[PDB]
Design a binder for this molecule. Structure first.
Ligand code: GTS
Ligand code: GTS
Lengths: 219, 219
């Protein structure tokens, strides 16, 4: 089989979603954490990062970089990419909006302190008046347990991850989304997911303060 | 067949790549240009933008939003997405780095004037010391006319588009990349592409000044 090698900083960043996807597929993986600028330079020196950047996953003989390229690949091979040409349109259109808000939130602990409060208000607004209603809409439309195809797919995992971050951001934002709430429980309960959520796994912690400082050396 | 409907501002923005892809596939499309905040509000009011945003293409009965979702869909249906599960890894990993630099350049005519010169220097550096060598590497590795699978795919089109923007940015940056140069000629010469490049097509003009101002009302 071969255990994929993920290269990244000891942080969620962009690799987090990849970690989540792999674990959900029940595929064990090895990681090499970039801990020093040296590590990174050495990494680049090897000529294995197509654009001198990470994420980069060694898998099936490829040195696949680019978050979406990696995820996309993993999704197909582990049948987490739906049944056909239209389901993926849905999955695709559902994952990107999920990526959007994710970044939106990320920014919060990265922006000029002078403007945090305002960005946060926007993020909350967006979260509850744009994103959540959208996904909730999707669930309410078919009443089935999975977002697409009534079969587990990558967005289900992606949605879970986002919901977990929204819960870390402002938990009250999720209290008016029943099906989403229920969804979170369901997906979280999946054996693979549960294991990953259990402490002692490759899931990385949220950043800020402690992590903000460590970023101020390499990330 | 049905002619897809693309909703967007009268600008390249994020839809440009979609326009390029469609034309390359020889698929005619209709567009409804967002010309007034009203237009946009009305557009949103209809409840057809999953996240209240555009790009959004009506196609095959879907109101598909999300740039990458749309492109991805178009690529598969018009067989511009390679032969298999590994070629797309390549295509994927090649399109995103192409999207990266694109945005990088975009920023130039959007950043605080105080810092343009510096960002531009970085963009030029990146262009010629990171991106171009990468794609050039890909071409030099197999000597065939297409980047992947020796068959025309979406990245070929995406690469062309980027090269055209790099040519608009700083043409001298392309003079040390033979195969890229040749590639540009080849792809540009493709009947579908040529037509699109010919004036009087749906290809949008670059922004700034004239366009900067018009953005200051809606975009
Ligand atoms: N589009 C890339 C972005 C990757 C990226 O920006 N990588 C950064 C690090 S981080 O922002 O993700 O932390 C990097 O490797 N930068 C190092 C370099 O470019 O030399 C992706 O999604 O994979
Ligand atoms: N991730 C989306 C981004 C789309 C986006 O940001 N759309 C903006 C307009 S633009 O930045 O592309 O010009 C929008 O519709 N904003 C209106 C709104 O959000 O209400 C995509 O790639 O499709």
């Amino acid at each position: 089989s071969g255990k994929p090698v993920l290269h990244y900083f000891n942080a969620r960043g962009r690799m987090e979603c990849i970690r989540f996807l792999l674990a959900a597929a029940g595929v064990e993986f090895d990681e090499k954490f970039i801990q020093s600028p040296e590590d990174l330079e050495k990494l680049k020196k090897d000529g294995n990062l197509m654009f001198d950047q990470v994420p980069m996953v060694e898998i099936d003989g490829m040195k696949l970089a680019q978050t979406r390229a990696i995820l996309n690949y993993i999704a197909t091979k582990y049948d987490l990419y739906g049944k056909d040409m239209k389901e993926r349109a849905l999955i695709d259109m559902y994952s990107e909006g999920i990526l959007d808000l994710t970044e939106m939130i990320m920014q919060l602990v990265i922006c000029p302190p002078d403007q945090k409060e305002a960005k946060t208000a926007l993020a909350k607004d967006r979260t509850k008046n744009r994103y959540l209603p959208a996904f909730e809409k999707v669930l309410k439309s078919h009443g089935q347990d999975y977002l697409v195809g009534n079969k587990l797919t990558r967005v289900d995992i992606h949605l879970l991850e986002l919901l977990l971050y929204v819960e870390e951001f402002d938990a009250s934002l999720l209290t008016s989304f029943p099906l989403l709430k229920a969804f979170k429980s369901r997906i979280s309960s999946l054996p693979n997911v549960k294991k990953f959520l259990q402490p002692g796994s490759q899931r990385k912690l949220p950043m800020d303060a402690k992590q903000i400082e460590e970023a101020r050396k390499i990330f």
